[PDB]
Design an enzyme around this catalytic site. Structure first.
Site, PDB file in Angstrom:
ATOM      1  N   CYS B  62       0.873  -1.146  -0.030  1.00 37.01           N
ATOM      2  CA  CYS B  62       0.108   0.063   0.084  1.00 37.01           C
ATOM      3  C   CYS B  62       0.685   1.343  -0.001  1.00 37.01           C
ATOM      4  O   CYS B  62       1.580   1.597   0.925  1.00 37.01           O
ATOM      5  CB  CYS B  62      -0.841  -0.047   1.314  1.00 37.01           C
ATOM      6  SG  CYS B  62      -1.858   1.489   1.486  1.00 37.01           S
ATOM      7  N   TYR B 194      -5.621   5.574  -9.214  1.00 42.36           N
ATOM      8  CA  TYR B 194      -6.823   4.615  -8.898  1.00 42.36           C
ATOM      9  C   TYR B 194      -8.339   4.898  -9.419  1.00 42.36           C
ATOM     10  O   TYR B 194      -9.084   4.436  -9.945  1.00 42.36           O
ATOM     11  CB  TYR B 194      -7.295   4.817  -7.130  1.00 42.36           C
ATOM     12  CG  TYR B 194      -6.258   3.906  -6.318  1.00 42.36           C
ATOM     13  CD1 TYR B 194      -6.670   2.582  -5.929  1.00 42.36           C
ATOM     14  CD2 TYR B 194      -4.855   4.256  -5.786  1.00 42.36           C
ATOM     15  CE1 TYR B 194      -5.787   1.790  -5.062  1.00 42.36           C
ATOM     16  CE2 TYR B 194      -3.996   3.369  -5.283  1.00 42.36           C
ATOM     17  CZ  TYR B 194      -4.534   2.130  -5.093  1.00 42.36           C
ATOM     18  OH  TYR B 194      -3.686   1.646  -4.316  1.00 42.36           O
TER      19      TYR B 194
HETATM   20  N1  LIG Z   1      -7.074   7.032   4.654  1.00 42.10           N
HETATM   21  C1  LIG Z   1      -5.931   6.320   4.617  1.00 42.10           C
HETATM   22  C2  LIG Z   1      -6.214   5.624   2.994  1.00 42.10           C
HETATM   23  C3  LIG Z   1      -5.395   4.353   2.842  1.00 42.10           C
HETATM   24  C4  LIG Z   1      -5.983   3.464   2.130  1.00 42.10           C
HETATM   25  O1  LIG Z   1      -7.209   3.582   1.668  1.00 42.10           O
HETATM   26  N2  LIG Z   1      -5.252   1.974   1.978  1.00 42.10           N
HETATM   27  C5  LIG Z   1      -5.816   1.111   1.310  1.00 42.10           C
HETATM   28  C6  LIG Z   1      -4.503   0.289   0.657  1.00 42.10           C
HETATM   29  S1  LIG Z   1      -4.210   0.638  -1.184  1.00 42.10           S
HETATM   30  C7  LIG Z   1      -6.893   0.194   2.200  1.00 42.10           C
HETATM   31  O2  LIG Z   1      -6.398  -0.122   3.342  1.00 42.10           O
HETATM   32  N3  LIG Z   1      -7.813  -0.097   1.577  1.00 42.10           N
HETATM   33  C8  LIG Z   1      -8.631  -1.273   2.311  1.00 42.10           C
HETATM   34  C9  LIG Z   1     -10.099  -1.086   1.910  1.00 42.10           C
HETATM   35  O3  LIG Z   1     -10.583   0.045   1.256  1.00 42.10           O
HETATM   36  O4  LIG Z   1     -11.064  -2.161   2.033  1.00 42.10           O
HETATM   37  C10 LIG Z   1      -4.650   6.570   4.651  1.00 42.10           C
HETATM   38  O5  LIG Z   1      -4.306   7.718   3.723  1.00 42.10           O
HETATM   39  O6  LIG Z   1      -3.876   6.549   5.445  1.00 42.10           O
END
Ligand SMILES: N[C@@H](CCC(=O)N[C@@H](CS)C(=O)NCC(=O)O)C(=O)O
Ligand SMILES: N[C@@H](CCC(=O)N[C@@H](CS)C(=O)NCC(=O)O)C(=O)O
EC number: 1.8.5.7
Lengths: 326, 327
Positions: B62, B194
């Site tokens: 990530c 994205y």
């Molecule tokens: N608000 C978070 C966004 C990070 C994020 O959305 N990471 C993704 C990985 S690319 C995630 O854990 N998504 C899992 C999901 O949406 O189910 C940050 O900036 O720390």
């Protein structure tokens, strides 16, 4: 697919039970000849003449593309008319839906689907409904739907009637050409499909490695001289080029053949622009058809139907391979 | 998937909504770790910098989570921040503590099964997305933050008196420039790839991917003027751009169809990419197996086959010259 006279929307089928499809699927392996004699397979008597033969192609297919290229090089436009199926090969297979620019519709009989013409030649027909199709307007039947052979007919059968000079399968080079054709088909022409449609990660890895192994080989050969067999353009080059012209715009991304782009190879890229810039060839290249077809027709691998913006390239840049060689 | 009122939903998140703009946990977790335990500009106080208290749940795949690992190296916070790496395969249960994949460690604190269990512990009826990175507080068994842009601010200063390595990646003098870069780099690049990858229509993709290449072009111009985005100093704006850049050729190019140019086609962007990659401690934070596995296998909506492309050839080890070229 088309089973014993009836269509089947990718419903091919419930399984098998005797036995490969089928007894009439490559029953279209006749030859156009100068005398009307039957060729090495199939039956006579499709004699070379004007206003008789017709081509059903998609501009998106690298196999159909071969026939269009040979049609240009041999000056067969005044002998051979052309119909262009719609790029979107959906649930009905090749379609005569015009409206997409460069799509003509069945300009002979105004059918609605490519499979209809297959029936009009064999209503009990079992097998795939493919482009290109070389069609006899006088017997309302299919001469041939095998592109490797269609381009050989075009090569000599019209010479006495005024075809342009050129022999792309010269008796001297024939064994070299058949040899090139052999592995270029397995590892490149058909190679990118084995990769893009691979069933497992293991399958894909093997196919895509073959692809790039062969590209390295070809880059080497091109290399020692202007074309595959030497200083002479043959059908082996044409058969390689139709895949090449589609590589960066489709295969790199869509079929995940993405280790290198054609634009990264000194010679292959030069070869690509070389044949691309031959008089009359650029016009047989239609990227909209090419890209709409692959990205939109292949739901099993690109469900979103999204057409990528595509790798940057300029095929109009002077190549100098005419100077460089020999 | 997604947590709704304490209940996980296998990606039916939800059956539409009928209510609606999630949620009372859209307040997410926005506390701040500070030097003296005072509260940051959001959340509550009590999260004072100290040893053996704070933990970081990440995925090595990530780019957001990656920001925190990098800041952890640059600031020398390994003595203060322990780490758990979830499994790269993000399936019907969301982030998973499945070890077995090399680099995945399982839940090193409580050996849970799912990331979302940690969220539930912090808020038994939480409704929202279960994301990495998560900054976890071992003392109070709750989540400090799950916002990477703020975690790096905390790492950047909160430990300065406990032995953190000198370095300010968001110093007062550069904050305005940095905030401005972050703004557009976030919208057109970090998150732009994205918007392109997951575009619903051809028009949505067309607009996203052009902004991506429009911004790279602008970045290429900027990075031909000095070593980094704001001058000769590395800042968090570089770090935030870099985590996307390093995933661009292995994934975004093919998987997200951002394929007009490769990062390796740009003299400066590719230099900046190798330059940061080659800083001491940075390369360890990069795991292409986690990256390529996560994206290709997890996004069955985009890549039904789960095939991992062989991937654009590159080589981040070659010297870059940028340390001398400027200035
Ligand atoms: N608000 C978070 C966004 C990070 C994020 O959305 N990471 C993704 C990985 S690319 C995630 O854990 N998504 C899992 C999901 O949406 O189910 C940050 O900036 O720390
Ligand atoms: N071997 C024949 C087959 C040509 C071929 O594979 N055509 C493809 C174009 S990609 C086709 O029309 N396939 C449609 C189908 O299989 O349903 C040739 O060389 O022309």
């Amino acid at each position: 697919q088309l089973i014993d006279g009836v269509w089947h929307d990718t419903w091919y089928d419930t399984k098998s039970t005797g036995g490969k499809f089928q007894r009439s699927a490559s029953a279209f392996r006749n030859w156009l000849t100068a005398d009307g004699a039957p060729g090495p397979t199939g039956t006579g008597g499709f004699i070379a003449e004007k206003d008789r033969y017709h081509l059903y192609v998609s501009l998106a297919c690298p196999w159909a593309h071969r026939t269009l290229i040979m049609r240009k090089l041999k000056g067969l436009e005044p002998f051979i008319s052309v119909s262009v199926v719609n790029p979107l090969m959906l649930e009905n297979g090749w379609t005569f839906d015009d409206s997409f620019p460069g799509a003509t519709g069945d300009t002979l009989y105004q059918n609605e689907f490519l499979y209809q013409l297959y029936l009009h030649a064999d209503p009990h027909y079992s097998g795939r409904v493919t482009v290109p199709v070389l069609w006899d307007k006088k017997n309302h039947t299919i001469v041939s739907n095998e592109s490797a052979e269609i381009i050989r007919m075009f090569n000599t059968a019209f010479d006495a009637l005024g075809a342009k000079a050129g022999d792309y399968y010269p008796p001297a080079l024939q064994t070299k050409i058949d040899e090139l054709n052999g592995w270029i088909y397995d590892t490149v022409n058909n190679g990118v499909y084995k990769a893009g449609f691979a069933t497992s990660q293991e399958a894909y890895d093997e196919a895509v490695a073959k692809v790039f192994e062969s590209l390295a080989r070809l880059e080497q050969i091109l290399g020692q001289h202007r074309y595959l067999t030497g200083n002479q353009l043959t059908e082996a080059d044409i058969r390689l080029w139709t895949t090449l012209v589609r590589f960066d715009p489709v295969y790199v991304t869509h079929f995940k053949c993405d280790k290198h782009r054609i634009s990264d190879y000194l010679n292959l890229y030069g070869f690509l622009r070389d044949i691309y810039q031959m008089p009359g060839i650029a016009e047989t290249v239609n990227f909209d058809h090419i890209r709409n077809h692959y990205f939109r027709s292949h739901k099993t691998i690109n469900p979103t139907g999204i057409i990528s913006i595509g790798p940057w390239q300029d095929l109009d840049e002077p190549h100098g391979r005419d100077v460089r060689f020999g």
